Ligand binder design. Structure first.
Ligand SMILES: Cc1ccc(CNS(=O)(=O)c2ccc(S(N)(=O)=O)s2)cc1
Ligand SMILES: [Hg+2]
Ligand SMILES: [Zn+2]
Length: 257
């Protein structure tokens, strides 16, 4: 139904998902001058050493790398979070051009892509229960800028050929998500939502200050994916990002000064 085209894109979402005009919708523009440094913010704790990746799949909206979340294998704690959040999957949002693609923007600046590492609050039992809670999810957002190649991203890039169309999946085990993290863990944080329908306002967003760089050819591979299924007219998977939403009654806190 929904998509990123002119006829079923972001501007149409509200008709099927009224929460699209809610009070804590994402993404937002991060105005660095009005973001408030919070000294009571703890450092993030990212434990991805036991992460067990399983599959990669093109879901017609993006490609996602899924992880085994049956136990506390790869978890996020600390920062503005209270509780353990399990890594379930990560995906990207990218543009048709290098100057667009990220969902969040910094001082109106757009990056070439944006990585979202999706985690759910374990106190809720399963992902489905987590999406019914205001503190159910924690998404780690990482900006991608074009520059030198990111070694840890190449494994992902090499498998894109086998999942070109919607519904295709491939085994993708033993992938280490630690190779996708910047050197610094400083971040901005604010309460928001999922950026694609159902747009549930259950997310504590943690956006890293430091972006990772990827080569021109790495992000180029992203753009060769298809939104369509095999046998259907080809539509390149590009610009699968949602425009910034009004911040409203929310303040962005920074873990750094
Ligand atoms: C019951 C149910 C609810 C929601 C989903 C969405 N699927 S999902 O949670 O993985 C995401 C959609 C958008 C994401 S973003 N771009 O904000 O990180 S994460 C599936 C199933
Ligand atoms: Hg919620
Ligand atoms: Zn996303």
């Amino acid at each position: 139904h929904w998509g990123y085209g002119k006829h079923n894109g972001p501007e149409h979402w509200h008709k099927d998902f009224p929460i699209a005009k809610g009070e804590r919708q994402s993404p937002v523009d991060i105005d660095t001058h009005t973001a408030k440094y919070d000294p009571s913010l703890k450092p993030l704790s990212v434990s991805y050493d036991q992460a067990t990746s399983l599959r990669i799949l093109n879901n017609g909206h993006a490609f996602n790398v899924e992880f085994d979340d049956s136990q506390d294998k790869a978890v996020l704690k600390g920062g503005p979070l209270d509780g353990t959040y399990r890594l379930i999957q990560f995906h990207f949002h990218w543009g048709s051009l290098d100057g667009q693609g990220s969902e969040h923007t910094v001082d109106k600046k757009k990056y070439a892509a944006e990585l979202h590492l999706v985690h759910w609050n374990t106190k809720y039992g399963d992902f489905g229960k987590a999406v019914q809670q205001p503190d159910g999810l924690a998404v780690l957002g990482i900006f991608l800028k074009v520059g030198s190649a990111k070694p840890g991203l190449q494994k992902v890039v090499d498998v894109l050929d086998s999942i070109k169309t919607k519904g295709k999946s491939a085994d993708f085990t033993n992938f280490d998500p630690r190779g996708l993290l910047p050197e610094s863990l400083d971040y901005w944080t604010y309460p928001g939502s999922l950026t694609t329908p159902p747009l549930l306002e259950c997310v504590t967003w943690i956006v890293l200050k430091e972006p990772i760089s990827v080569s021109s050819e790495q992000v180029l591979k992203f753009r060769k994916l298809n939104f369509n299924g095999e046998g259907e007219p080809e539509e390149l998977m590009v610009d699968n990002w949602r425009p910034a939403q009004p911040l409203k009654n929310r303040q962005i806190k920074a873990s750094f000064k």
